[PDB]
């Protein structure tokens, strides 16, 4: 009835984007990392910079789409390890190095728009899934515990990319387990529990995708 990939080694430590709107990059690498574990039995930190500086279809620190990232990794025939291409919190010139290649991608799939059931199936059957949400509310930002729900959250304002690393229930409230990229300091050790099956709250199923490996 539930699943938490953190327990399974599919999830890396919580990262911090700093002063850069690279949430999409962190989300993409997170999905990629999960697939790396699943396919190879092990993972490592992949490099968000590689995406920031090389995904021309995206806007660097100005925002991007996870799908464009997955596409780049496939076309490029690889993505670098973090250690290989470290994160500096600003966009720089593309310095991808094949010597550093730590994962590959053979494409991607998008979850059917608005369908939480499909999202649950994807998390169960694939592993961690890249998602986008409205993270603009004061209440989201000061989150610390419980299952987050705020009706004013706007499902049509997907301003922040994150990663669904599981799903479950807590004190009768169904939820998604969500990995953020605002440091371990934010939320519950970098994570937030977000309401599930409550009319696609915060647009959680609006822009969901995963990489094929």
């Amino acid at each position: 009835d539930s699943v938490d990939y953190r327990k399974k080694g599919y999830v890396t430590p919580v990262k911090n984007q700093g002063q850069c709107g690279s949430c999409w990059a962190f989300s993409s690498v997170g999905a990629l990392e999960g697939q790396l574990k699943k396919k190879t039995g092990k993972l490592l930190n992949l490099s968000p910079q590689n995406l920031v500086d090389c995904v021309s279809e995206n806007d660097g620190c100005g925002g991007g789409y996870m799908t464009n990232a997955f596409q780049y990794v496939q076309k490029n025939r690889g993505i670098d390890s973090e250690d290989a291409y470290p994160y500096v919190g600003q966009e720089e010139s593309c310095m991808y190095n094949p010597t550093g290649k730590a994962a590959k991608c053979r494409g991607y799939r998008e979850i059917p728009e608005g369908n939480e059931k499909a999202l649950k199936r994807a998390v169960a059957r694939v592993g961690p899934v890249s998602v986008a949400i409205d993270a603009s509310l004061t209440s989201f930002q000061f989150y610390s515990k419980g299952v987050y729900y705020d009706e004013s959250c706007n499902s049509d304002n997907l301003n922040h990319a994150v990663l669904a690393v599981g799903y479950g229930i807590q004190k009768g409230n169904k939820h998604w387990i969500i990995k953020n990229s605002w440091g371990e300091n934010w939320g519950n050790k970098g994570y937030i529990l977000m309401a599930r099956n409550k009319n696609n709250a915060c647009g959680i199923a609006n822009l969901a995708s995963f990489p094929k490996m």
Partner: peptide, 4 residues
């Protein structure tokens, strides 16, 4: 979605 501007996803940052």
């Amino acid at each position: 979605x501007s996803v940052r």
